[PDB]
Amino acid sequence: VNKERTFLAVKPDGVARGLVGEIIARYEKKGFVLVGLKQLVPTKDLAESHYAEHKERPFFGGLVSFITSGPVVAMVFEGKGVVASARLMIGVTNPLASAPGSIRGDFGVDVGRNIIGGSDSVESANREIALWFKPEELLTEVKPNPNLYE
Amino acid sequence: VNKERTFLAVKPDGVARGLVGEIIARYEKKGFVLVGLKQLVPTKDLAESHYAEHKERPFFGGLVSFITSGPVVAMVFEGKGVVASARLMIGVTNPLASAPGSIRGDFGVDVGRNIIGGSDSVESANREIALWFKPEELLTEVKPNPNLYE
Amino acid sequence: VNKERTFLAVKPDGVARGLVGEIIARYEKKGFVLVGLKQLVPTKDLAESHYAEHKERPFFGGLVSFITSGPVVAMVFEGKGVVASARLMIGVTNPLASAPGSIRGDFGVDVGRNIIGGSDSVESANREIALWFKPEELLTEVKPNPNLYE
Amino acid sequence: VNKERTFLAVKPDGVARGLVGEIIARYEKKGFVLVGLKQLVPTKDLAESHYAEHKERPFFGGLVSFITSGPVVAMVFEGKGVVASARLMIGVTNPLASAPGSIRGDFGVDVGRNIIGGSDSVESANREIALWFKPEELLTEVKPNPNLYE
Amino acid sequence: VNKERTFLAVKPDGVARGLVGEIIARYEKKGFVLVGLKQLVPTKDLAESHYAEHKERPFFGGLVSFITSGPVVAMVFEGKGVVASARLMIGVTNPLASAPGSIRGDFGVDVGRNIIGGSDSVESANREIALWFKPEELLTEVKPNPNLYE
Amino acid sequence: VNKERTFLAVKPDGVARGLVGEIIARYEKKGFVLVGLKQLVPTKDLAESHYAEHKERPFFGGLVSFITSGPVVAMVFEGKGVVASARLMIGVTNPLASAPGSIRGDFGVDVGRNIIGGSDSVESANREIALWFKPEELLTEVKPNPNLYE
Ligand SMILES: NC(=O)c1ncn([C@@H]2O[C@H](COP(=O)(O)OP(=O)(O)OP(=O)(O)O)[C@@H](O)[C@H]2O)n1
Ligand SMILES: NC(=O)c1ncn([C@@H]2O[C@H](COP(=O)(O)OP(=O)(O)OP(=O)(O)O)[C@@H](O)[C@H]2O)n1
Ligand SMILES: NC(=O)c1ncn([C@@H]2O[C@H](COP(=O)(O)OP(=O)(O)OP(=O)(O)O)[C@@H](O)[C@H]2O)n1
Ligand SMILES: NC(=O)c1ncn([C@@H]2O[C@H](COP(=O)(O)OP(=O)(O)OP(=O)(O)O)[C@@H](O)[C@H]2O)n1
Ligand SMILES: NC(=O)c1ncn([C@@H]2O[C@H](COP(=O)(O)OP(=O)(O)OP(=O)(O)O)[C@@H](O)[C@H]2O)n1
Ligand SMILES: NC(=O)c1ncn([C@@H]2O[C@H](COP(=O)(O)OP(=O)(O)OP(=O)(O)O)[C@@H](O)[C@H]2O)n1
Ligand SMILES: [Mg+2]
Ligand SMILES: [Mg+2]
Ligand SMILES: [Mg+2]
Ligand SMILES: [Mg+2]
Ligand SMILES: [Mg+2]
Ligand SMILES: [Mg+2]
């Protein structure tokens, strides 16, 4: 359905490097609709809950550390196959290996500072969305451009 | 001081036309820092409180009406003389009379649908900011690029 | 009713310098609608008819000469106060004196090679439009973004 | 030889979403030359003739339907291997599966509304060109930037 | 004559904020030709010689100080009325008072950190050029796009 | 330690087509730091020394010929894995086969006129760097954005 939603977040480096507008603009141009948007400073709780799947990973330390060292602009986009498309537009985990045209490919160089993050599946999305947004912080009335869908 | 803050809001038409990223990007490029950011649907209360100065104005009707017909992404930018600069970057009330290069000048044509709004004075700002954001929704730790100020 | 239409034309230098897309994109971004569009090579007739008002002027020679030395993409845009707005976005006759942000201001340096031309009044428009386009080469069903006007 | 030509067309959704300039600009930047350009509203004849190869596929219905629901800006570009290159710049049939950087990859989400179409072979080109343009609507004197070729 | 040349320099903050390409790109788009280009770290000598006219003003101190705190990419552009046009594209001394569309207007906020500097007269140019470049570091064979001039 | 440096050069066609700013801007946006930058006209010596590996190749003739037919802006960028990343951003030898988003993919069409060149290995880099720049023409104090690496 055209109501699939994904969770995306501009990490501290992204926000600090002034890439918030640029990134949002890409998804707006793609046709996806913004249903949730806000800036905050992740709490160590939220951080570990979010990256829960890596708690036993060597990098989990600095990750949670960094992810809370400054503001993060979290957002939710809605659209047909947005979860898979958003990832594609982001690139791969290593910015250096990301193709030109993708977000990481155009702006990053270090795996630790890769500008943005986003849900890797509809499952992970729903979870991460609920985890970061309160029900009333998300639109319900989503009306996209009529020139978008058939 | 370099801690001046202004209130800016992408009106429904702006948000609907997909200009959120583009607009934010301009202020980020200018050097101003994002201290507050969120999307919501203005309530008739907030609407009238915001445009309180025009309650006796002929257009006050449709204004408050429209301003709540859909999502609005409100935001707060901080920086040296941001209130006056932000207005300058916006243009004048009538998009048609706004110079190329300014936001309204580049995207609008109707006074009723002029993409964005912003505080016209430090006074109006403080008021509008407090009016739209809750104290904890705004950063306190604002560290701009060091290449920005002397 | 606000369907005012204007005639704009990317002169040979503009077309040759590959600025067609760029220029169209600006007016599209502004909100104006494209009702007529085509590329051709002006005939000495059309040329003199077009610049009829300068037939006794000392430059009329090279003008008509140049304006037909290569392709020209003529177009018609429709929208509220488009004639005046389009001129504003173009700049002034001398590119060097045109402000940054305007078309001539951003791309030209010589009065003889100023990238684009456009009707300077609703009168001149109607005349120039009819002069360059055949009635069936122009849309009649013009439906703009429902977010542009109120 | 650098005389190869291809047929490209901004479909109604593309035109309606205001992507005409943007798209033309990409091909101009690539180095290809514009030999034919015009806006029109496809007739059911032209439509079926164009998509003749799909008269049986379960989508031929809505396709021809849509392709004529509004203006389309058809165009012809000339240059070394333009047919294959143009397709590459477009992406694949499904916008969601198209890579960032390509036209569909950057602007579309639905297979039915994929912004643009273009000849898939020199054969299909010649046919589609002749089908859409009258001989005198195409330049013959094509002089590209000298810096493009060896 | 279209031989006029001006001296422009991206100051340390500009270079540090990664605006070198962006700035050069503007002048290239305008039609001016690059005759000299290089990156270096101004010496206190060069610095004071350059800003010789301000040796008394209360800011000459930090100015010379800053202008040598890091790399600077100096450059020379050639073209009809380039000195006046370049300044226009830069804006005014105070970035906050510079119009959107101009370099300072779009990227700076502090008079002390105004991204770029440029000769304010043909006189000042010749002097500053000779002062920063060695005769063989400047082209002599300057051939601009033929579409720029009449 | 990640100060890997690479040598890149905007060939005559690139410089002539006015793509210098655009190209530099991409690498600046990527996060790489500019350590060396200058414009010159390659001497037949430098040319053959540079393309030494192709002296017996059938194209070596016109190559060296062209590479010295006009100005070239040589530059050195420093950053984590810059040599491999820079190549990726450039595309493949044939512009037509280069993906959208890469430099050649977006601007070139002919293998002979492919806008830019860059070291294909750390080995080739060191060699080409030393070959094109004098030790004091390269920075030593390289301080990148503190947000780029962890
Ligand atoms: N050194 C490594 O092997 C490694 N893997 C991940 N990381 C850092 O941790 C974040 C999450 O890792 P993931 O494997 O989920 O990658 P991702 O899917 O691209 O990231 P995200 O969840 O933040 O969108 C990554 O975004 C990155 O900052 N380092
Ligand atoms: N028809 C009129 O004369 C008129 N004046 C204002 N308006 C609509 O009401 C909004 C607020 O008016 P203001 O005079 O405050 O203009 P503004 O300062 O540019 O707007 P804002 O407060 O929304 O930033 C305007 O932004 C516009 O949408 N119509
Ligand atoms: N040297 C002069 O004083 C002079 N005045 C005009 N011109 C050339 O002639 C074209 C037509 O003159 P106009 O005064 O009508 O220019 P415009 O109103 O700015 O633009 P356009 O005619 O092309 O729509 C101009 O666009 C320009 O190329 N040279
Ligand atoms: N639902 C489907 O399975 C399907 N297949 C095609 N389509 C729509 O019909 C157009 C023509 O199909 P093609 O396979 O020829 O697409 P194309 O090669 O990418 O583009 P075009 O014909 O429009 O140049 C496509 O561009 C697309 O709009 N829908
Ligand atoms: N605080 C002040 O009153 C003041 N005045 C000048 N400045 C700094 O010194 C630079 C030189 O002053 P100018 O008045 O010559 O500025 P300009 O004409 O815009 O630029 P430039 O000399 O750097 O080409 C200015 O560009 C600016 O960085 N601060
Ligand atoms: N026709 C051919 O098969 C052929 N191969 C190379 N060339 C021309 O010679 C330049 C140098 O060849 P390379 O294979 O080293 O190219 P590259 O590695 O992609 O780039 P560069 O040498 O310029 O850094 C190429 O950039 C290209 O202009 N033509
Ligand atoms: Mg993950
Ligand atoms: Mg107001
Ligand atoms: Mg006129
Ligand atoms: Mg097909
Ligand atoms: Mg000065
Ligand atoms: Mg090589």
**Helix H or strand E segment including B8:** strand B5-10
Q: What token pair was written down for D30?
A: 């690539």
Q: How far is CA A108 from CA A59, A115, F36, F90, in A?
A: 18, 7, 21, 16
Q: Are C66 and C47 in contact (CB under 8 A)?
A: no
Q: What token pair was written down for E134?
A: 């060695």
Phi, psi of F95 (to 5 degrees): -50, -40
Measured between alpha carbons, how far is E19 from C76 in angstroms, rounded to an integer? 37
Q: Which of E101, E94, E84 is nearest to E115 (CA)?
A: E94
CB contact under 8 A, F112 and D149: yes
CB contact under 8 A, B29 and E66: no
Q: Calculate Rg over the CA atoms of chain E.
A: 15
Whether ligand 1 lies within 6 angstroms of the CB of A10 is answered as no
| Ligand 6 centroid distance, CA of F3 (Å) | 26
Neighbours of chain C (3+ CB pairs under 8 A): B, D, E
3-state secondary structure of B39: strand
Measured between alpha carbons, how far is A115 from A97 in angstroms, rounded to an integer? 14
Q: How far is CA C44 from CA A124, C51, D84, E149, in A?
A: 66, 11, 38, 22
**Helix H or strand E segment including C36:** strand C33-40
Q: Are C5 and C35 in contact (CB under 8 A)?
A: yes
CB contact under 8 A, C110 and E30: no
Mutate to test the pocket of ligand 3, among C63, C75, C93, C132 (most ligand atoms within 8 A of CB): C93
| Ligand 11 centroid distance, CA of E130 (Å) | 16
3-state secondary structure of B95: helix
Measured between alpha carbons, how far is B137 from B144 in angstroms, rounded to an integer? 18
Interface of E with B (CB under 8 A): 12-13, 16-17, 62, 66, 96, 99-102, 105-113
> Which one of B69, B90, B110 makes the best mutation probe of the C interface by having the most chain C beta carbons within 10 Å?
B110
CB contact under 8 A, A109 and F32: yes
CB contact under 8 A, C21 and D21: yes
Q: Tell me which residues have their CB closer than 6 angstroms to ligand 4.
A: D 59, 63, 93, 111-112, 114, 117-118, 120
Interface of C with D (CB under 8 A): 15, 18-29, 34, 36-41, 71, 73, 137, 139, 141, 145
Q: What does DSSP assign to residue E113?
A: B
Mutate to test the pocket of ligand 6, among F60, F65, F93 (most ligand atoms within 8 A of CB): F93
Candidates A15, A24, A39; nearest CB to B21 = A24
Measured between alpha carbons, how far is E72 from B119 in angstroms, rounded to an integer? 37
Q: Between β-strands C72-78 and C5-10, what pairing exists: parallel, antiparallel or unpaired?
A: antiparallel
* Chain D nearest C-alpha distance from C26 (Å): 8
CA angle C5-C122-C145, nearest 5°? 25
Residue given tokens 């930047």 in the structure block: D29
3-state secondary structure of B102: strand
Atom of ligand 3 nearest to the CA of C93: 19
CB contact under 8 A, E30 and C107: yes
Measured between alpha carbons, how far is C103 from A128 in angstroms, rounded to an integer? 45
The residue type of A131 is L
Phi-psi region of C144 (alpha: psi -120 to 50; beta: other; left: phi over 0): beta
Beta bridge partners of B112: none
Give me the half-sphere count of Cα atoms (radius 13 Å) on the Cβ side of residue D42: 25
Domain ranges for chain F: 1-150
Q: What is the DSSP string of A66-97?
A: HTTSS-EEEEEEESTTHHHHHHHHH--SSGGG
Per this entry, what is the length of chain B? 150
Candidates B29, B37, B70; nearest CB to A73 = B37
> Which one of A102, A107, A116, A147 makes the best mutation probe of the D interface by having the most chain D beta carbons within 10 Å?
A147
Residue given tokens 């593309």 in the structure block: D14
Resolution (A): 2.9
CB neighbours (10 Å) of residue E55?
11
Q: How far is CA B44 from CA A40, B65, B126, in A?
A: 27, 8, 21
Measured between alpha carbons, how far is E138 from D43 in angstroms, rounded to an integer? 59
Q: Which ligand is nearest to the CA of D118?
A: 4
Q: Which of D21, F56, D109, E59 is nearest to A81 (CA)?
A: D109
CA angle D82-D87-D91, nearest 5°? 150
Measured between alpha carbons, how far is B110 from B72 in angstroms, rounded to an integer? 18
Atom of ligand 3 nearest to the CA of C53: 15
Helical axes F82-90 vs F20-30, angle rounded to 10°: 130
Q: Which of C102, E21, C77, C31 is nearest to B102 (CA)?
A: C102
Q: Which of A146, A77, A58 is nearest to A116 (CA)?
A: A77
Q: What token pair was written down for F21?
A: 């700013």
Q: Between β-strands F5-10 and B5-10, what pairing exists: parallel, antiparallel or unpaired?
A: unpaired
Q: Which of C75, C67, C72 is nearest to C119 (CA)?
A: C75
Longest dimension (CA), chain F: 47
Q: What is the DSSP string of C105-148?
A: HHH--BTTB-SEEE-SSHHHHHHHHHHH--GGGS-S-----TTS
Residue given tokens 């590209």 in the structure block: D144
Q: Between β-strands A5-10 and A116-118, what pairing exists: parallel, antiparallel or unpaired?
A: antiparallel
3-state secondary structure of E27: helix
Chain C with chain D: Cβ pairs closer than 8 A: 72
Q: Which residues of C touch B17 (CB under 8 A)?
A: 145, 147-148
CA angle D44-D46-D47, nearest 5°? 60
Residue given tokens 């060069």 in the structure block: E46
Q: Which residues of A touch F99 (CB under 8 A)?
A: 99-101
Interface of B with E (CB under 8 A): 26, 29-32, 79-81, 84-85, 88-89, 99-103, 105, 145, 147-150
Residue given tokens 């120039």 in the structure block: C128
Beta bridge partners of C38: C74, D38
The residue type of B51 is Y
Q: Which of B46, B113, B103 is nearest to B74 (CA)?
A: B46
SS3 of chain D: the string is: CCCCEEEEEECHHHHHCCCHHHHHHHHHHHCCEEEEEEEECCCHHHHHHHCHHHCCCCCHHHHHHHCCCCCEEEEEEECCCHHHHHHHHHCCCCHHHCCECEHHHHHCCECCECCEEECCCHHHHHHHHHHHCCHHHCCCCCCCCCCCCC
Q: What token pair was written down for A64?
A: 């949670």
Task: Measure CA D52 to chain center.
Answer: 16
Interface of E with C (CB under 8 A): 26, 29-32, 79-81, 84-85, 88-89, 99-103, 105, 145, 147-150
- Please list the alpha-helical segments (H only) found in chain B: 12-16, 20-30, 44-50, 60-66, 82-90, 103-107, 122-132
Q: How far is CA F28 from CA A143, E39, E113, F34, F150, in A?
A: 38, 14, 19, 8, 19
Measured between alpha carbons, how far is D8 from D28 in angstroms, rounded to an integer? 13
Phi-psi region of F79 (alpha: psi -120 to 50; beta: other; left: phi over 0): left
Q: What does DSSP assign to residue C99?
A: P
Q: Are E86 and E29 in contact (CB under 8 A)?
A: no
Q: How far is CA E51 from CA C3, C79, E42, E96, E143, in A?
A: 55, 50, 12, 22, 32
Q: Which of C27, C7, C24 is nearest to C148 (CA)?
A: C27
CB contact under 8 A, A106 and F31: no
Q: What is the dihedral of CA E39, E44, E46, E49, to 10 degrees?
A: 150
Candidates B101, B108, B112; nearest CB to C31 = B108
Measured between alpha carbons, how far is D15 from D116 in angstroms, rounded to an integer? 9
Q: Are D123 and D141 in contact (CB under 8 A)?
A: no
The residue type of E5 is R
Q: What token pair was written down for A28?
A: 């707006």
Phi, psi of F105 (to 5 degrees): -60, -35
> Which one of C11, C23, C109 makes the best mutation probe of the E interface by having the most chain E beta carbons within 10 Å?
C109
Q: Which of B133, E31, C118, B18 is nearest to A147 (CA)?
A: B18
Q: What does DSSP assign to residue F68?
A: T
A82 class by beta-carbon count within 10 Å (0-12 exposed, 13-18 middle, 19+ buried): buried
Q: Which of B138, B117, B99, B98 is nearest to B7 (CA)?
A: B117
Beta bridge partners of D76: D7, D36
Measured between alpha carbons, how far is E150 from E21 in angstroms, rounded to an integer? 29
**Helix H or strand E segment including C20:** helix C20-30
Helical axes C82-90 vs C20-30, angle rounded to 10°: 130
Per this entry, what is the length of chain D? 150
CB neighbours (10 Å) of residue D64?
21
A58 class by beta-carbon count within 10 Å (0-12 exposed, 13-18 middle, 19+ buried): exposed
Which CATH entry fits the domain spanning F1-150: 3.30.300.30, 3.60.15.10, 3.30.70.141, 3.30.465.10? 3.30.70.141
Using CA positions, which residue lies closest to atom 13 of ligand 2? Answer: B93
| Ligand 11 centroid distance, CA of B139 (Å) | 38
Measured between alpha carbons, how far is F18 from F10 in angstroms, rounded to an integer? 10
Measured between alpha carbons, how far is E113 from B148 in angstroms, rounded to an integer? 6
Q: Which of F43, B8, D20 is nearest to E136 (CA)?
A: F43
Q: What does DSSP assign to residue E102?
A: B
Measured between alpha carbons, how far is C84 from F36 in angstroms, rounded to an integer? 47
Using CA positions, which residue lies closest to atom 21 of ligand 5? Answer: E117
Q: What token pair was written down for C7?
A: 């005639």
**Helix H or strand E segment including A116:** strand A116-118
Task: Measure CA E14 to chain center.
Answer: 11
Q: Are E77 and B115 in contact (CB under 8 A)?
A: no
CB contact under 8 A, E109 and B145: no
Helical axes B20-30 vs A20-30, angle rounded to 10°: 160
Q: Tell me which residues have their CB closer than 6 angstroms to ligand 6.
A: F 59, 63, 93, 111-112, 114, 117-118, 120
Where chain D is discontinuous (C–N > 2.5 Å), the residues before each break are none
Q: Which residues of E touch C105 (CB under 8 A)?
A: 101
Whether ligand 5 lies within 6 angstroms of the CB of E93 is answered as yes
CB contact under 8 A, A105 and F101: yes
Q: Which method resolved this structure?
A: X-ray
Longest dimension (CA), chain B: 47
Phi-psi region of C79 (alpha: psi -120 to 50; beta: other; left: phi over 0): left
Measured between alpha carbons, how far is D42 from D61 in angstroms, rounded to an integer? 15
Measured between alpha carbons, how far is F25 from D40 in angstroms, rounded to an integer? 38
Q: What token pair was written down for B84?
A: 């006056």
| Ligand 6 centroid distance, CA of F59 (Å) | 9
**Helix H or strand E segment including E85:** helix E82-90
CA angle A22-A28-A33, nearest 5°? 135
CA angle C9-C15-C17, nearest 5°? 135
Residue given tokens 């916008």 in the structure block: D95
Using CA coordinates, name the residue in chain D closest to F59.
D150
Measured between alpha carbons, how far is B132 from C96 in angstroms, rounded to an integer? 44
Whether ligand 3 lies within 6 angstroms of the CB of C62 is answered as no
CB neighbours (10 Å) of residue A122?
15
Measured between alpha carbons, how far is C150 from D20 in angstroms, rounded to an integer? 25
Q: Which of A86, A84, A75 is nearest to A27 (CA)?
A: A86
Phi, psi of C33 (to 5 degrees): -105, 140
Q: Which of E145, A100, D89, D7 is nearest to F109 (CA)?
A: D89
Q: How far is CA A35 from CA A3, A73, D13, in A?
A: 11, 14, 23
